[PDB]
């Protein structure tokens, strides 16, 4: 055994005591039976039984009396032999879990006569106030009635003796002389004394070391009040006793109808979650109030999951746009997921627009999946290799474009997440018909194609000398293009390739090797198309694909604003593609055209008779300028300048680099508005028009925008759930900022009226103040 | 990142959190509020720029009144950082996220009648503060109060869409900025907002409106809502200025004289609050720390605050033990109760304050938050309904919560308990379903991690099922009030009896959990089931739980018989219906004298139990008939047992007749006369247990034959015929008497149940006997527990650590402190250098002859003389004048000069001195009872040594002892470990004191059976000494246990000259000079008890058996000496060389131990020297023999010590005459 100082929670189990020996008063029969006597006669006329005593021990606490610790009780020998046990006993209170404040309590209780055994108590401390518990050593104690003690004399040369358990500096002689010392111990039996009313006894409880004791330890984590408190008292609130469920209406319903009227996002109050929670009956009556409703209240317990999910198949169905709120990650209720499913069963076209909004979803359809893997896995173990995922797999394997959709899909989540690459195979599995494979393999080749393309990337030559290099390559690859039979095109699923033309194709000059090249299709017409390699395009295309989007929802107002929405996507992880469009420069356009005006008189010149008024070309470029303002504003589009933006000939503003965005710019945070000096000031020769036309434009946009924005909104959390380029924990302060620069919280339109006063201060500085002006050259000088 | 302090944010302009809400006015500029976090742990701070703030920038007084306001921590809230920068301006404060008027919807259970008043009164003795700071006009809005786990107000400067509180004053006085005025305000001002803002708060909307500053200058308004708080608030509304509104006079128009000291207190502890609620600015943990401490504190404090207001006698706390020992102070968790709410209130006592704490108590920074906790339940005496709801809901969300300590569900079954404690009516209608669904939940929180004892709250909630029984009485207690009006008495009984009928469901899962618990096995929870049978009465449900429990008292006679021998006396509580069951029980009696004693003890409570209650006669006559033949054992218990037949017989002749059939007193009258009769039937069961051994001896034996010369009597007759001849000599074997002639056929059944205690085991000249029982081990498992405490591996050090952690470590520390040091220290401290052992090869081989006679003090013999070993030895000795020598070893080699090189004056007669290992101290005694060392000081000069002066370093005074003692010999030693001296007194007493501290360490007395000390010797470790004893016995003893080790004898039982430890010869072996007569020295080895080489003088071989080791031999031997002059002599030995100085022909020995017969005499006679030769006459035993075949004159030598020069050994020699001389 070893000593060494070990605290409370460094210390580990629970205490145990061994006790023996003790003190015969021989008043009685050694036993402390009857209280012997010649005078006997009174002991039959007492009643005096003759007890065996027996022992107890139990721990009075902390000296708070309390009770902690557990009674216990040995067998019975002779206590006429005087009981000496040395008899190990034990209670299940750890060290760690010991208070240093505790107390030992013992009772020995005898067995005397009819309904009668005796009883004795006492009392001791359990650790020392040097914290070392009874010294992890052994003892000897007295006790009387009431209010008596333990001391050290011979108790003290026994301690001594437990000061050779104690390790003092000790040698293997001294261990011999230690067997003569079981001689000495043994001499030690020679005590003796007489006392009464109080009595002694000898026992040991000597350990290898000397404890230590002090309190537990804590953890503070995330001055101050904190979340889980308000869970305690509102769910202490939350009791809702008698069963019987009224059905009343009043004026308030109007109001309460409002409150459930708030975006998904909100989280709210406790007050407003039990009048939503009363509000059930007009919460089954109102479509809009579904998701609000479900929102409204937390399924942990069968008990409120029984009402929930029995109200779930019960209430009217909710709309499909609203619908998209209670699909995120937020709940992942099995009722919802399942119940959101069979209203997801219906798959239109959208669908396919809403398919990158669905590999989010994929992203996110893993939770507790170790056991369905396991289920897989079951059925994997026969044959060697060689859930609304069930609608999504029957979504693919019904039109083979979309199936080509989702493994195009797939081939971006490939990299992310290493399951998805094993998903693709079942993807292939979860389609029957081969038909779209073979046009898939095709399709599979382009990876190939743009191995190549890196291949060609990979050597460093002349502008001139990559530029013939990458016609001979386009010569090479228009051979394989004729070779190989006709694929999917990558701007439209339905459209077909026929083959490409090689001296049609170009080459980019930028740092990032793009490749553009003009393909014959099987329509038997040329188109243009850019691809690029060696780069994540998902940020662009996301965003894109968010353009196309809101371009629906503009034309869902029966309004276009002309913008056109360039097709982007991403076949490798490094690799993408987009489809070409006529853009130059802005620094070009302004050097060599010398303004925007001749740029545009280019294409299509158009002097009127009267005011030399141009058309619909600069009537879509005010349209589009308006509507790239709006889509700036709301978006929040970071990284574009005069090199991000483009022009196109067909009458449309061009808008690149979305990687930044959600309130990220590379220099300081600038205002929402993405509009420069110079189409400030040609909107601003014909602001008496063209500035209240653009006004009316905006203001059209904002309201129809912030009407639909709600399922835009919750489809934004849910790619946010997944995850993100350029942001990450972004996400809470991303969708916040989504609903500040929406001004959700505000019912009045006047907001954009500030910001379209904030464009006539960029024209002019309303110098406030001297670090204003300097903020408006600021402003200016980054452009 | 391009640049340093900026942000991401458009409207940020440094580093923070996310985004955050906001607020503009007419009245004054937009604001922004922002966060600043430290990785998820955020402040509310307010958004401000610099960058665009230079232009202005006259924050100075506005920075005054920051560091003035904030500097002070009241109950108001105070801002935490008012700061601008080279970027952001930005202000900041504590994190609150509660608003006054939101918290007032948010917390409809935390808003109180009491409490209202009480944060509004903290609010008025903050605002006349800063009326009486000089300071005010700080806009006051309903956003400004903030709140807490703590449920405290705290006000802010800023108060930042709401209602805006205006200021009659600049509102009136307005015209055109009135005429381009500056920054003005009053306390007026801030007495009307604050008295709106007031209002505000206490009807929970304001008065804010255009319509109604209209009207306040229409001079009339509307009242409609107490009288002097309508009057006292309308004095500060009607008029700011001119009504005189005085803060401070309304603070002493408090209405309250209880609730102003009540308050007052509480302002203290308000302090106490702030104390807890106080780039870098403060520390993380500092908060834990704060809160810890203030909880702790907050008790500690409790005690006495307790005493202020509203007391009790008794409590569960110390200062509550104190005053619970007057009303005098098994084990039950019981207090003080709430006896109907405090007699319905009497003393109007409602304080919130404990919800408050017991709020912040939820936390927890240490062990001591379970006091917290506990202190927050002792809080919950105040009985309130609604209150009590909160406080009952908190405990088990504790329960809940921490899964860490297991020391959480017993505060959590504490504060339960007190809940069980309230003793209230449901005050509404859901306290039924809502205690349903608590028990569920009480149920969901049982299941937990492994290992973890639930069973005291499982005996617990069993002992609270009778307060269960109660809740469906408050439930009745509902109905009831519920049936006080017209046309629903009816429905409310029809509703209770419904729910009761849904509450047997609950009752039905409870006995399940119960079941549960009862079937788990963590026999804890078994012993758990005495209290559930206890308070089983609420329980009126069959006797399938019984059974259960009579499975499990046979599952427990399997294998925890032990425990249910406990489980069954606790089972003879069943007072049940259906007696036929206790038949069963009778037959569980028979099964219950299987095996364990215990079982046999509790039998017979089980027996008294019955006794007191009976069922049938004649069963339980038949029963007894057999019990009390079966009670004759001499058992301590069997006796109790037996005295209830005497009871038994008191519920009578034809019984008096069947009993005296079998009665084994033929002098039996009564019950007196029955204890006679106990009294004449005692026996010893002694044998009666080796019976048993024969038994079962006879159960291993082959009891196959069944030859000679199954009902009842047939066990009997087999049991005799087992054994012939082995039970005869048996029967020998014992008393054997006319007593002992009992039969006692009951031992028949007892066998075969101790046969089937032997068939819960394996199969059961003569081979090793079998034990009856077997020791535990509980020692080296202890060690290997060690072990795997080591594999967890906490800390210790055997030498000094580093100053550990500030905690209640500290006590360990103190520890560290309460041990005494520096042993070590004392030794580099003083009394100069220290220097070191320098040894020389054996110097026996060398002729020897004297170089120098020296005598300096011709009138004396030295009673002591030493050598300071070294390159240059430091001659010494002293004089029975008491004076003291010394002289240089080299200068009397080279240059002959003699005389005392130093001389110290003793004043009195010296007795000895030796040299301090490893040091140039020398130490002395004087027989005047002077004890005390000398530091020696020399110095190196022209290639050579001289010294300088002689000075004692430490004086202790040996007459201290109090009897007048001289020191007889004194003996000093310096360990690495530690050093130390050790003496024998005038009595011969060994005493050693310590070197370090110049204080005895302990007294060490040898028997007076020994006459006086032979000699003085230390043992190798010196952990034992070595003493001769004057009676001629050798005494070794231990010091280690303080005792003495052994005592040895030998030859012919004469005077020891002197003992000593040799060095060849090692620890295992001492050299004694003393004993036989003829003997020289007698050497003889510890352990092996004989002596293995004994140098004898004389001419012939001495008997072998006058040689042999004398033990048996007692006190009672007379001494014997001799006066003869060969008998006084001193010798030393060092380095395999044992010199003596023979005082017989009166000159030098030497003994070589390396060779006895090499060994030969330095200085002898002229004509002719000694042949000496050695021999052995017994394998373990030795013996050297000495065969014998005059300018030098001088006297019996007194002292003698070895040296060496450093250039060829010598020796040195100081005679009775007071003469020295040297011999290379």
Same mark, same amino acid.
């Given at each position: 055994?070893?000593?060494?100082f070990?605290?409370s929670?460094?210390?580990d ?11 015969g ?6 036993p402390?039976?009857? &209280?012997?006597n ?38 019975? &020998?002779?206590?006429?032999?005087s009981?000496?046990?040395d ?35 006492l ?8 914290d ?6 052994? $003892? ?12 050290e004399?011979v ?45 002694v ?5 000597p350990?290898?070391?000397l404890?230590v004791?002090?309190?537990?330890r ?43 009227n ?17 509000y059930?009956?007009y ?5 809009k ?13 069968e008990? $409120? ?5 029995e109200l ?14 209670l ?23 959208k ?11 994929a ?15 079951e ?7 060689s859930?609304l ?26 990299e992310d ?20 494979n ?12 743009r191995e ?21 390559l ?25 083959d ?24 038997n ?7 690029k ?18 371009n ?5 107002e ?13 076949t ?5 593609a987009?489809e070409?469009?006529?853009?130059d ?7 060599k ?6 740029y ?6 158009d ?20 509507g ?28 690149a ?14 205002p ?7 189409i ?12 209240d ?10 309201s129809?925008l ?18 993100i ?15 500040e ?32 002006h ?9 452009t | ?5 900026? /942000?991401?944010?458009s ?5 923070? =959190?996310?985004?955050y ?23 509310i ?9 230079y ?15 904030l ?10 950082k ?14 609150? +996220? ?9 917390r ?25 700071? !000089?300071?005010?006009?700080?806009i006051k ?6 709140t ?12 930042f869409?709401?209602?805006? /509180?205006?200021?009659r ?5 307005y ?19 604050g ?14 409106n ?57 302002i203290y502890?308000?302090?106490?609050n ?6 870098t ?37 110390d ?19 709430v006896?109907?709410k ?15 704490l ?28 609604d209150?009590? +709801?909160?406080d ?46 608590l ?28 307060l ?44 399940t ?22 308070t ?29 021998e ?9 007072? !049940? ?9 009778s ?34 006559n038949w ?14 218990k ?7 037949c ?13 009993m005296?059939?079998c ?23 002694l044998?009666?247990?080796?019976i048993?051994?024969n ?14 010369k ?6 009997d ?17 014992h ?14 059944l ?7 205690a032997?068939?819960?085991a ?31 591996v ?5 030498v ?14 103190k ?12 030794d ?8 070191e052992?320098?040894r020389s ?34 001659? !010494? ?19 002959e ?40 000081? @020399? ?8 010294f300088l002066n002689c ?15 001289? /020191? ?15 003496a ?37 470790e010196?952990?034992?000494?070595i ?17 003495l080790?052994?005592?040895?004898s ?7 000259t @002197? ?9 295992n ?10 003997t ?5 080895n ?13 001419? =012939? ?10 033990? +048996? ?14 008998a ?6 060092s ?27 330095? !200085? ?14 017994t ?13 030098? @004159?001088?006297d ?18 100081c ?10």
């Open positions: 055994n070893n000593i060494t070990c605290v929670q460094d210390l189990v629970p205490l145990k005591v061994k006790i023996k020996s003790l003190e008063h021989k008043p009685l029969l050694k402390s039976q009857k &209280i012997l010649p005078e006997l006669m009174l002991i039959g006329s007492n009643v005096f039984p003759s007890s065996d005593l027996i022992v107890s021990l139990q721990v009075f606490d902390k000296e708070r009396n309390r009770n902690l610790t557990l009674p216990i009780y040995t067998p019975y &020998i002779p206590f006429r032999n009981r000496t046990w008899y190990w006993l034990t209670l299940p209170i750890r060290i760690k879990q010991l208070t240093f404040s505790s107390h030992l309590r013992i009772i020995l209780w005898e067995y005397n006569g009819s309904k009668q055994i005796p009883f004795f108590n009392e001791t401390s359990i650790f020392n106030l040097k070392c518990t009874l010294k992890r050593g052994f $003892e000897s104690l007295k006790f009387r009635y009431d209010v008596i003690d333990h001391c004399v108790t003290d040369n026994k301690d001594q003796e437990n000061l050779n358990k104690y390790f003092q500096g000790e040698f293997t002689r001294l261990p011999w002389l230690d067997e003569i010392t079981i001689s000495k111990l043994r001499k030690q039996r020679e005590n003796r004394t007489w006392p009464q009313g109080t009595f006894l000898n026992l040991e409880f350990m290898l070391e404890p004791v002090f309190i537990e804590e953890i503070m984590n995330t001055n101050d009040p904190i979340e889980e408190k308000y869970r305690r008292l509102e769910r202490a609130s939350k009791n809702a006793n008698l069963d019987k469920q009224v059905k009343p209406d009043i004026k308030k319903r109007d109001y309460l109808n409002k409150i459930i708030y975006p998904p996002g909100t989280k709210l109050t406790a007050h407003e979650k039990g009048s939503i929670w009363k059930r009956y919460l089954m009556n109102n479509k109030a579904l998701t609000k409703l479900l929102q409204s209240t937390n399924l942990r317990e008990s $409120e999951r029984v009402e929930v999910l779930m198949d019960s209430w009217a169905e909710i709309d499909i746009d609203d619908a998209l709120e699909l995120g990650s937020t709940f992942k209720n099995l009722s919802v997921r399942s119940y959101a499913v069979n209203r997801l069963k219906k798959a239109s076209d669908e396919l627009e809403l398919y990158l909004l669905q590999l989010v979803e992203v996110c359809f893993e939770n507790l999946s170790t056991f369905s893997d396991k289920s897989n896995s059925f994997t173990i026969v044959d060697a290799v859930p995922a069930e609608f999504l797999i029957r979504r693919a394997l019904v039109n083979p474009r979309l199936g080509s959709f989702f493994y195009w899909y797939l081939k971006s989540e490939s997440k290493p399951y998805l690459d094993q998903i693709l195979s079942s993807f292939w599995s979860r389609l029957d018909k081969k038909s779209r073979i046009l898939n393999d095709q399709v599979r080749l382009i990876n190939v194609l190549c393309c890196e291949t060609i990337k990979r050597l460093k030559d002349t502008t001139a000398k990559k530029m013939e290099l990458l016609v001979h386009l010569e090479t690859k228009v051979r394989p293009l004729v070779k190989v039979r006709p694929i999917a095109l990558p701007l439209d699923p339905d459209v077909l390739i026929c490409v033309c090689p001296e049609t194709s170009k080459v980019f000059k930028s740092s990032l090797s793009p490749l553009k090249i003009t393909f014959k299709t099987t329509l017409q040329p188109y243009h198309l850019m691809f390699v060696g780069d994540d395009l998902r940020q662009d295309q996301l965003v894109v694909q968010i353009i196309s989007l809101m629906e929802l503009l034309k869902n029966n309004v276009d604003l002309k913008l056109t929405p360039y097709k982007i996507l991403a490798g992880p490094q690799e993408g987009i070409f469009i006529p853009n420069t802005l620094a070009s356009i302004l050097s055209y010398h303004g925007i005006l001749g545009l008189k280019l294409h299509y010149p002097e009127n008779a009267t005011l030399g008024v141009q058309g619909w070309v600069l009537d879509n470029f005010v349209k589009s300028c308006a790239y303002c709006v889509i700036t504003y709301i978006l929040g589009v970071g990284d574009r300048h005069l090199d991000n933006l483009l022009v196109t000939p067909d009458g449309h503003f061009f808008h680099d979305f990687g930044y965005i959600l309130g990220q710019d590379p220099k300081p945070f600038p929402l508005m993405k509009l420069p000096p110079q400030i000031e040609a909107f601003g020769g014909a602001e008496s028009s063209n500035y036309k653009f006004r009316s434009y905006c203001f059209v946009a904002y129809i912030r009407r639909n924005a709600g399922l835009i909104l919750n489809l934004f959390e849910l790619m946010k759930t997944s995850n380029p350029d942001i990450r924990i972004d996400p809470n302060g991303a969708i916040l900022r989504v609903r620069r929406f001004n959700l919280n505000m019912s009045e339109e006047d907001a954009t009226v500030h910001f379209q006063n904030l464009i006539n201060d960029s024209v002019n500085a309303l110098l406030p103040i001297v670090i204003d300097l903020h408006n050259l600021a402003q200016y000088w980054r | 990142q391009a640049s340093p302090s900026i /942000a991401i944010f409207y940020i302009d440094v580093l923070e =959190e996310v985004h809400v906001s607020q503009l006015n007419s009245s004054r500029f937009l604001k922004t509020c922002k966060a600043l976090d430290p990785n998820g742990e955020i402040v701070k307010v958004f401000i720029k610099p960058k665009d703030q232009s202005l920038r006259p924050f100075l007084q506005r920075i005054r009144a920051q560091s003035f306001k500097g002070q921590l009241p109950h108001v809230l105070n801002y935490s008012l700061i601008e920068t080279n970027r952001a301006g930005y202000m900041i404060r504590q994190h609150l +996220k509660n608003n006054l008027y939101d918290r007032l919807s948010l409809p259970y935390l808003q109180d009648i009491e409490l209202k008043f009480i944060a509004f009164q903290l609010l008025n003795a903050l605002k006349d503060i800063h009326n009486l700071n !000089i300071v005010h006009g700080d809005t309903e956003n400004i109060l903030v807490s786990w703590n449920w405290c107000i705290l006000t802010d400067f800023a108060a869409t709401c209602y805006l /509180a205006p200021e004053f600049n509102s009136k006085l015209q055109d900025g009135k005429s381009n005025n500056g920054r003005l305000t009053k306390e007026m001002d801030i007495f009307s907002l008295c709106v803002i007031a209002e505000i708060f206490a009807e929970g909307r304001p008065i804010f255009l319509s109604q500053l209209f009207k306040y200058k229409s001079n009339s308004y509307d009242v409609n809502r107490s009288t002097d708080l309508r009057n006292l608030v309308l004095d500060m509304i009607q008029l700011d200025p001119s009504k005189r509104l005085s803060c401070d006079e309304l603070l002493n128009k408090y209405r309250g004289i209880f609730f102003p000291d009540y308050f007052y207190t509480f502890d308000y302090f106490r702030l104390v807890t609620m106080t780039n600015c403060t520390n993380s943990t500092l908060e834990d720390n704060v809160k810890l401490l203030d909880e702790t504190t907050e008790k500690i404090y409790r005690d006495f605050s307790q005493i202020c207001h509203c007391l009790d006698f008794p409590l569960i706390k200062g509550g033990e104190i005053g619970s020992d007057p009303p005098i102070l098994l084990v039950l968790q019981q207090f003080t109760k006896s109907e405090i007699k319905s209130v009497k003393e109007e006592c409602a304080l919130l304050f404990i919800s408050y017991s709020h912040s108590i939820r936390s927890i920074v240490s062990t001591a938050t379970k006091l917290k906790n506990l202190e927050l339940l002792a809080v919950f005496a105040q009985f309130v309904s209150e009590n +709801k909160i009952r809901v908190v405990p088990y969300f504790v329960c809940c919560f921490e899964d860490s300590d297991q020391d959480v569900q017993a505060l959590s079954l504490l504060t339960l308990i007190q809940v069980l404690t309230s003793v209230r009516k449901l005050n509404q209608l859901n306290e039924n379903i809502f205690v349903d669904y028990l569920p939940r009480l149920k969901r929180l049982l299941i937990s991690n492994r290992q973890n004892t639930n069973y005291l709250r499982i005996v617990f909630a069993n002992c609270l099922s009778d269960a029984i109660i809740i469906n009485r408050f439930q009745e207690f509902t109905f009831a009030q519920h049936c006080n009006d017209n046309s629903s008495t009816k429905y409310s009984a029809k509703l209770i009896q419904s729910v009761e009928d849904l509450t047997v469901s609950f009752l039905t899962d409870n006995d959990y119960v079941k549960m618990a009862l079937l788990q096995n963590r026999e804890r929870t078994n012993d758990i089931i005495l209290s559930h049978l206890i089983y009465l609420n329980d009126k449900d069959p006797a399938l739980r019984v059974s259960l429990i009579q499975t499990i008292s046979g599952i427990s006679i399997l294998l925890g018989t032990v425990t249910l406990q489980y069954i006396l606790p089972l003879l509580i069943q007072t !049940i219906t259906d007696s036929e069951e206790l038949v069963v029980i037959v569980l009696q028979s099964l219950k004298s299987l095996f364990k004693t215990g079982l046999i003890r509790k039998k017979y409570y089980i027996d008294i139990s019955k006794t007191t209650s009976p069922l049938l006669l004649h069963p339980n029963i007894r008939q057999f019990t009390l033949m079966i009670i004759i054992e001499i058992i301590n069997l006796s109790k047992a037996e005295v209830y005497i009871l038994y017989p008191i519920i009578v002749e034809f019984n008096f007749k069947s005296i059939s009665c084994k007193q033929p002098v039996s009258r009564s019950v007196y006369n029955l204890l006679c009769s106990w009294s004449v039937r005692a026996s010893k069961s044998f009666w247990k080796k048993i051994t038994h079962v001896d006879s159960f291993g034996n082959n009891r196959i034959e069944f030859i000679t199954s009902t009842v009597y047939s066990h007759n087999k049991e005799i015929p087992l054994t012939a001849e082995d039970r005869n000599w048996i029967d020998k074997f008393i054997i008497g006319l007593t002992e002639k009992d039969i006692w056929k009951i031992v028949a007892r066998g075969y149940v101790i046969r089937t032997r068939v819960m394996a199969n059961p000249n003569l081979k090793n006997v079998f034990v009856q029982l077997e020791p535990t081990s509980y020692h080296m498992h202890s060690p290997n527990h060690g072990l795997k405490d080591n594999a967890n906490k800390p210790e050090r055997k000094v650590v580093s100053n550990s952690y500030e905690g209640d470590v500290e006590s360990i520390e520890f560290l402190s309460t041990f005494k040091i520096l042993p070590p220290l004392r580099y401290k003083e009394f100069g250098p220290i220097q052992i320098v090869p054996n110097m026996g081989n060398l002729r020897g002859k004297l170089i120098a006679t020296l005598m300096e003090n011709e009138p004396n013999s030295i009673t002591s003389s030493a050598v300071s070993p070294g390159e240059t030895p430091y001659l !010494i000795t002293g004089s029975d004048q008491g004076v003291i020598k010394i002289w240089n070893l080299k200068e009397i080699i080279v240059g000069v003699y005389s005392s090189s130093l001389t110290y004056d003793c004043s009195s007669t010296v007795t000895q001195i030796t040299m301090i290992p490893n040091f140039d101290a020398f130490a002395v005694s004087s027989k005047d009872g002077q004890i005390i060392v000398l530091k020696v000081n @020399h110095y190196q000069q022209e290639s050579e040594v001289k000075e004692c370093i430490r004086k202790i005074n040996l007459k201290n002892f109090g009897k007048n003692e001289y /020191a007889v010999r004194m003996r000093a030693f310096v360990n690495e470990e530690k050093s130390l001296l050790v024998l007194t005038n009595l011969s007493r060994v005493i050693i004191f310590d070197i370090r501290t110049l204080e005895r360490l302990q007294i060490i007395e040898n028997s007076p059976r020994h006459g006086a000390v032979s000699s003085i010797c230390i043992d190798e010196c952990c034992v000494l003493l001769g004893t004057t009676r001629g016995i050798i005494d070794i003893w231990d010091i280690r246990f303080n005792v080790i052994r005592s040895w030998f030859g012919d039982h004469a005077p020891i @002197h003992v000593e430890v040799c060095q060849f010869y090692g620890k072996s001492v050299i004694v000079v003393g004993g036989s007569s003829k020289f020295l007698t050497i003889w510890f352990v092996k008890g004989h002596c293995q080489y004994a140098f004898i003088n004389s001419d =012939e071989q001495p008997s072998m058996e006058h040689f042999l080791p004398i033990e +048996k031999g007692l006190e009672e031997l007379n001494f014997c000496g001799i006066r003869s002059l060969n006084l002599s001193t010798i030393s030995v380095n395999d060389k044992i010199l003596l100085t023979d005082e017989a022909t009166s000159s030098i020995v030497m003994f070589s131990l390396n060779e006895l017969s090499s060994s030969k005499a330095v !200085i002898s006679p002229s004509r002719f020297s000694d042949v000496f030769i050695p021999t052995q006459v394998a373990n035993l030795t013996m050297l023999l000495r065969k014998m075949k005059s300018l030098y @004159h001088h019996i030598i007194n002292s003698i010590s070895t040296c060496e020069v450093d250039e060829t050994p010598l020796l040195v020699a005679d009775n005459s007071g003469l020295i001389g040297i011999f290379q």
